[PDB]
């Protein structure tokens, strides 16, 4: 009876370049149960998002801020996937495969704190909405 949870904001994100880990900025869509995102906001509305992170696939209870023993990035949030690995799978900083099973490390860091809180509550919210259904 009510909506799906939804949140748009940048989010800066550590990615694998291909080699070395950056983190890039990112303008993020969170809709149905994925984080979608593009470069920015215009792009929404114009092509597909340069990846989508899947909540359905989320590892924890509930989305925690990011552990300050491999994160130092201020205001960043952590949210680990897994599922059975594919023949796109490949190991990279953020991704790892063991087992025929791939787990991802995302890390996504907020402009503010108040926007780290905001996407946590968002986030865990949706994984509530994820386990209650049919």
């Known amino acids: 009876v009510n909506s799906s949870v939804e949140e748009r904001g940048f989010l800066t994100i550590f990615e694998d370049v291909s080699g070395?880990?950056?983190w890039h900025r990112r303008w993020?869509?969170?809709s149905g149960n994925c984080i979608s995102y593009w470069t920015?906001?215009?792009?929404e509305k114009r092509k597909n998002p340069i990846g989508r992170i899947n909540l359905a696939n989320c590892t924890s209870r509930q989305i925690e801020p990011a552990n300050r023993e491999f994160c130092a990035r201020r205001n960043t949030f952590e949210l680990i996937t897994v599922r059975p690995q594919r023949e796109d799978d490949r190991e990279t900083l953020v991704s790892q495969c063991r087992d025929t099973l791939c787990v991802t490390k995302n890390?996504?860091?907020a402009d503010t704190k108040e926007e780290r809180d905001l996407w946590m509550q968002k986030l865990n919210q949706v994984l509530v909405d994820i386990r209650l259904w049919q």
């Open 107 to 109: 890390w996504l860091s």
């Open 20 to 22: 070395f880990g950056a």
């Open 28 to 30: 993020c869509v969170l």
């Open 40 to 43: 920015y906001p215009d792009d």
